[PDB]
């Protein structure tokens with residue numbers, strides 16, 4: 001993901017494209033003052049165009065283009081579909097040649113600030129064979145150091161060790177005292193990852209996994225939120241975003257012509273390997289097996305389905321899915337309407353009423369209002385088959401703000417606690433459905449929080465959580481799960497709040 005430049009101003013971006021790019025060169029960058037605002041800067045005709053990309057929490061919105069689940073998916077889409085991006089005039093803007101960043105600050109293995117003993121101590125306590133990091137040399141400013149652990153993963157017996165390797169910076173290029181000079185640390189690290197260094201006496205300094213500092217015991221969260229609150233949240237979030245290059249899995253079924261009008265947004269699509277497949281379709285319907293939805297399985301375990309708000313033409317498919325998967329609990333993440341725009345289409349009957357949605361039949365038995373949500377008790381059955389009836393409990397969250405995130409996580413936490421006890425009380429209930437909007441932002445945020453508090457509920461303080469690792473695992477099952485830095489911070493705040501209420505228990 002070299003085309004993303006975290007610490008660049010607009011005028012710096014222009015100068016890079018004009019002096020080191022050509023027509024078709026391009027890069028993306030953030031605004032520093034306005035989080036969630038991004039810019040795509042592109043060269044055309046020896047001049048530079050800047051195109052804004054907005055994320056309020058639900059998707060990336062490219063002005064003059066489409067909506068996307070990640071910046072990597074945006075770039076992949078426009079590098080394979082020419083003529084497709086246009087300016088105000090309507091003229092064509094081509095993304096041909098990514099302009100690569102050399103700044104290493106968003107790489108998992110970069111820990112600029114560490115000293116040698118502090119790096120030895122981290123690798124000693126937290127690392128295993130092949131754990132590595134790169135830090136700035138203290139004794140030679142501008143130079144860097146590579147620290148690596150190697151040995152037997154079975155007390156302090158002498159079967160393992162840390163080694164250090166010095167990295168010179170000479171005329172803006174990096175080397176290990178011999179061989180090739182590299183244009184950046186990334187290229188040097190990538191090269192020795194594939195072709196590790198060997199000491200004369202045989203030891204192979206294998207670079208297998210970056211040092212892990214985000215795995216922590218649950219009673220540490222309080223002091224870690226404090227550290228991260230003093231732009232650390234930004235750094236850690238952006239480090240996670242630079243891993244999304246690894247999650248470009250295929251979405252071919254969602255691109256079929258037969259399926260185009262089943263998607264809220266044409267390029268926000270379900271991965272093929274985790275999509276929910278519908279069986280028992282009307283035999284006439286050429287393609288009856290598609291819904292924009294994915295199974296989320298955390299890696300007596302709870303699983304989820306993350307999905308979009310219905311289209312008026314996908315309401316029947318939504319009920320086919322709930323029935324087939326045996327789901328007994330639904331969470332809605334938005335109002336029907338926000339800012340005068342449809343965010344989650346009504347797909348249930350009015351209170352006390354009964355409606356048929358194709359082959360499925362739903363009764364709305366009772367609504368109950370709470371402060372932050374409405375609960376609707378629904379009864380779902382197949383038409384013509386009496387005792388297929390099951391209760392489905394629909395939890396509609398109603399107080400999420402239109403932009404950003406709640407200022408207090410208590411409401412969300414009290415909501416998931418109730419949703420969790422309902423699910424546990426029903427024997428053999430299927431996955432919990434979580435949906436509305438495009439089903440990636442709020443939906444990802446609710447699911448991740450739920451996974452993390454589950455661990456803490458079953459274990460207690462004596463449990464390791466790892467927030468960015470957990471999100472990466474859920475982003476491998478649906479595109480773009482958790483959209484913003486505000487949502488990312490919200491998840492840490494929710495975990496902190498949950499711990500501090502049980503620590504009063």
Ligand SMILES: Cn1cc(Cl)c2cccc(NS(=O)(=O)N3Cc4ccc(CN)cc4C3)c21
Pocket residue numbers: 104105106107108109110111210211212213214215235236239240243466468469472
């Ligand atoms: C463990 N894990 C797995 C995935 Cl995928 C992932 C993505 C991002 C972050 C971490 N955690 S980490 O311990 O590797 N990590 C914290 C952090 C914070 C700042 C920097 C400076 N760029 C570097 C690092 C390294 C991840």
